[PDB]
Write a protein that binds this DNA or RNA. Structure first.
Ligand SMILES: [Mg+2]
Lengths: 400, 549
DNA sequence: GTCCCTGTTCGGGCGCCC
DNA sequence: GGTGGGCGCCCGAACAGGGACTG
């Protein structure tokens, strides 16, 4: 009698068929553990091979604790389900807390003739049995469709907490609840625990920073030092058309040995000075379009030094970033990259409300072997594996 | 018998009729033995459909079989999600006090077919003696060559062995199709009499277990090997020693070899297997190549010499130890205590036009990992032909995000290395070379050349070429007209991209040479500048090579 | 737009298993 | 001759993507 809403897929499209990838004994075992409950408690059933579809699963140790979460990589089923404003002030709050609600969506029964798309498969260590398959009967976590259907009731739920507490903005993307406040941390948490006690029925946005393009400061210059300048400048061009290089690329006139010292002329030392100003200026012409893919890319500088940009149109960057991890004698590139992508996707969501598609500086096999170890979010962004021109690394680089 | 298991619903694709044709010769009659067993019933000729039929013989000639060519029905039945994800490995068996290996009898023919679908499996014998309007059955069980059978059967098997696998959370049953291996923490005669309660379970569900009941009989036979209480080995493999060779003749070989290379270390197949390169034929003979024949020689050598494998335990720990074999090839081997192999392998895959030994090492480590997760379900610890430091070098300067897991240096030559580093900084002393090449895309005529501060200038005209190529030829002039220290300035990202990446091999003759000369060099500094923007002296080279194009 | 040149997917052949 | 499904290994077809090009 709790009623169900019909849903279906983009027109002409068919449900997912994605191969499951190898899990670890501890991931399977934790997945077999919560799949047991997940069917007993009447939330999923079990299904045979007559279900042509399939979407992968792994399992995440979402804390330092011993409570595993299972997320389904619905990226593929997601981008085939017919879909449909964004709180602008959340990005500018003193701190934001992110709740995982979450176990709320099982409350509503998914539409039957759609359940067949929710199907997944649990593998066997060393293949000692065929895979055991299940299918959801109630709004699954990780699908565009759950937060949708449920908002109706989330809004009933939140109504009085949003009203009583006016200064706080609560936001809902996917399984996550982003709640924000100018409260001092400590007054914040007492509130966020007030939320949690209600729903029973740490991000600092104002601190996020942009790393602009920056020109090398030095008191003498070589041909080489200028060549690396003109070329960088020449590229910044495509971004700030208010740039200037000609009076500076005049200095490299003949065929000078890389190591010979050029002195900067009356204009040259001022052109470069005029340029280092233009780069302070805000990029003109950037307007977040909601219907276009959000494109994030990342370059690996060195010494746990990652730089990103986020854009929909080439050269029209919505945000340039620098994310700094560890400089270690036990450092993990993939782990870092994994952390980068997550942090970025989180600003991405907090600011613009949607999640970016990443252009990952990494071999696909390498990334696919490991990213599941080091993950911690209840969503998963779309990604493609690039190969970076080692040039466009110098452009966004930093200097000591 | 046919099982009491609920039946599994299968449709046809969203808009098909079902199959229908006919066939034709002394038609022989097992087809009535099935009749009285329930496995086919006879049908009334307003069932529209018919699928051809025929006879052959057994895969071990003991019976003179019957079979249907649903090759048409198969093409119209819904898609499945198959449920065999892989092939179990012996090396992943952690050994249990007691054991068995039994097989289900006539199992496809032991599970019911959805009845709303049986009609489509309607086949019809020609005639009792060459003509009368003949007989017409459907199937009531899983047919012997329909694409549904395997997936459906496997599911059913699983869904049945289930209550045994929880009524005993802890007796271990390896299930591949209709074949079983049993594992018990109990002493032989409680296992013996536990294996019964199991056989009896399957019987109750309609699966019989004849004999075929591998018993107090180590070596158990299973999955193509020869298990033992303490080791295991592959049932011997015989090499296609066919004095002349054609393609399919050689694929015969490599396949036996890759199967071979799972336990016999050292097996390598680079030269056999570039023989397929180019071909337009499947039977076309192939002249056994020199380095090939010499390589082929080597393999037959290994397999003579006998070997075993071992079992696993969560107790002791997994080790992988890679070793650089020949050209682009690698050989691994996992174990737990020193010379007792647990599994071995062979990664020879060639990914890229240009690579170096450190990325192949990375790939191999990648292949071995996911694979260990598959068999034992955990990541191993490595021991690798490369010094802890070379890695840090690589991992420092390589721009993509790379990473090998918990490893330790082994000293097994050849050792891995970077046959040269590029300079971060320009070279006081070195001629500063400005290179640039051009090429007309209509005429496919080109030009490559250089121009130094010391005022030198070559300009070789290339032909049948591409712009990218000449720009790599010019770097090539520069390196081979420069002495032991040199800076170069190229306009080409394409080129800067290849070389920064530090290739020791590539598919290209040009890059293979440009690698030669790079190793011979003492210090190089590769530097870029944007093309066509009037720079010194990228301007000067650029005209040199650009008149004519 | 056209060329290049890289990467990727896929299907075919064989291996081995039921 | 005219049988299904699975995993693996290779290789070549189809593409995808970029980066340079033409007048
Ligand atoms: Mg050029």
């Amino acid at each position: 009698p709790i009623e169900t809403v019909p849903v279906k897929l983009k027109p002409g499209m068919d449900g997912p068929k994605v191969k499951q990838w190898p899990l670890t004994e501890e991931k399977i075992k934790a997945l077999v553990e919560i799949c047991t409950e997940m069917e007993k408690e009447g939330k999923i059933s079990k299904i045979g091979p007559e279900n042509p579809y399939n979407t992968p699963v792994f399992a995440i140790k979402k804390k330092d604790s011993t409570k595993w979460r299972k997320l389904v990589d619905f990226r593929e089923l997601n981008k085939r389900t017919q879909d449909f404003p964004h709180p602008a002030g959340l990005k500018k709050k003193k701190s934001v807390t992110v709740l995982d609600v979450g176990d709320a969506y099982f409350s509503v029964p998914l539409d039957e003739d759609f359940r067949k798309y929710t199907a997944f498969t649990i593998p066997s260590i060393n293949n000692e049995t065929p895979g055991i398959r299940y299918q959801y009967n109630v709004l699954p976590q990780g699908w565009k469709g759950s937060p949708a259907i449920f908002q109706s009731s989330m809004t009933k739920i939140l109504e009085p907490f949003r009203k009583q507490n006016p200064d706080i903005v609560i936001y809902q993307y996917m399984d996550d609840l982003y709640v924000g406040s100018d409260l001092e941390i400590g007054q914040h948490r007492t509130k966020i625990e007030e939320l949690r006690q209600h729903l029973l029925r740490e991000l600092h946005p104002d601190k996020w920073t942009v790393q602009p393009i920056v020109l090398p400061e030095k008191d003498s210059w070589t041909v080489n030092d200028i060549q690396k300048l003109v070329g960088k400048l020449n590229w910044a061009s495509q971004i700030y058309p208010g740039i200037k290089v000609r009076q500076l690329s005049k200095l490299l006139r003949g065929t000078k040995a890389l190591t010979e010292v050029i002195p900067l002329t009356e204009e040259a030392e001022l052109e470069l000075a005029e340029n280092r100003e233009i780069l302070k200026e805000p990029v003109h012409g950037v307007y977040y379009d909601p219907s276009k893919d959000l494109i994030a890319e990342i370059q690996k500088q060195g010494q746990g030094q990652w730089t990103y940009q986020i854009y929909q149109e080439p050269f029209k960057n919505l945000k340039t970033g620098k994310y700094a991890r560890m400089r270690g004698a036990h450092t993990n590139d993939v782990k870092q990259l994994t952390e980068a992508v997550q942090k970025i996707t989180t600003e991405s969501i907090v600011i613009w409300g949607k999640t970016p598609k990443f252009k990952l500086p990494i071999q696909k096999e390498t990334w696919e072997t490991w990213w599941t170890e080091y993950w911690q979010a209840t969503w998963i962004p779309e990604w493609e594996f690039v190969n970076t021109p080692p040039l466009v690394k110098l452009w966004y680089q930093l200097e000591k | 018998p046919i099982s009491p298991i609920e039946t599994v619903p299968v449709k046809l694709k969203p808009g098909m009729d079902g199959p229908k044709v006919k066939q034709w010769k002394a038609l022989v009659e097992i087809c009535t033995e099935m009749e009285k067993e329930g496995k086919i019933s006879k049908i009334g000729p307003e069932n529209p459909y018919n699928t051809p039929v025929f006879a052959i013989k057994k895969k071990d000639s003991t019976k003179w079989r019957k079979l249907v060519d649903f090759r048409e029905l198969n093409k119209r039945t819904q898609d499945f999600w198959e449920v065999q994800l892989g092939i179990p490995h012996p090396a992943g068996l952690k050994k249990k006090k007691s054991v068995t290996v039994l097989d289900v009898g006539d199992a496809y023919f032991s599970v019911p077919l959805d009845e709303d679908f049986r009609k489509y499996t309607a086949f019809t014998i020609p005639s009792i003696n060459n003509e009368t309007p003949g007989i017409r059955y459907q199937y009531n069980v899983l047919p012997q060559g329909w694409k549904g059978s395997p997936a459906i059967f496997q599911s059913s098997m699983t869904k049945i062995l289930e209550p045994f696998r929880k009524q005993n959370p802890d007796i271990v049953i390896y299930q591949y199709m209709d074949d079983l291996y049993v594992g018990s923490d109990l002493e032989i005669g409680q296992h013996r009499t536990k294996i019964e309660e199991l056989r009896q379970h399957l019987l109750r569900w309609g699966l019989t277990t004849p004999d075929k009941k591998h018993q107090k009989e180590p070596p158990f036979l299973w999955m193509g090997y020869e298990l033992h209480p303490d080791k295991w080995t592959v049932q011997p493999i015989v090499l296609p020693e066919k004095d002349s060779w054609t393609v399919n003749d050689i694929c015969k070989l490599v396949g036996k070899l890759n199967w071979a290379s799972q336990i016999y270390p050292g097996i390598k197949v680079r030269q056999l297997s570039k023989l397929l390169r180019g071909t337009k034929a499947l039977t076309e003979v192939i002249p056994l190549t020199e380095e090939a024949e010499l390589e082929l020689a080597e393999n037959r050598e290994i397999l003579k010499e006998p070997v075993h494998g071992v079992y696993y335990d969560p107790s002791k720990d997994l080790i992988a130890e890679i070793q650089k074999q020949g050209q682009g090839q690698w050989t691994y081997q996992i174990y737990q205590e020193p010379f007792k192999n647990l599994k071995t392998g062979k990664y020879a895959r060639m990914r890229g036009a240009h690579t170096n030994d450190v990325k192949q090492l990375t790939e191999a480590v990648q292949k071995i990992t996911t694979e260990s997760i598959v068999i034992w379900g955990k990541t191993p610890k490595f021991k690798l032909p490369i010094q802890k430091e070379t890695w840090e070098t690589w991992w420092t300067e390589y721009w993509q995000a790379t990473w090998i897991p918990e490893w330790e240096f082994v000293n097994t030559p050849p050792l891995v290395k970077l046959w040269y580093q590029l300079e971060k900084e320009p070279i006081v002393g070195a001629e500063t070379f400005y290179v640039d090449g051009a090429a007309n895309r209509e005429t496919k005529l080109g030009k490559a050349g250089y121009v130094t501060n010391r005022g030198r200038q070559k300009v070789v005209t290339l032909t049948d070429t591409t712009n990218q190529k000449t720009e790599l030829q010019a770097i090539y002039l520069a390196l081979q007209d420069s002495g032991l220290e040199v800076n170069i300035v190229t306009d080409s990202q394409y080129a800067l991209g290849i070389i920064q990446a530090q290739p020791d091999q590539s598919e290209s003759e040009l890059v293979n040479q440009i690698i030669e000369q790079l190793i011979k060099k003492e210090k190089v500094y590769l530097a870029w500048v944007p093309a066509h923007k009037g720079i010194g002296g990228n301007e000067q080279v650029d005209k040199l090579v650009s008149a004519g194009i």
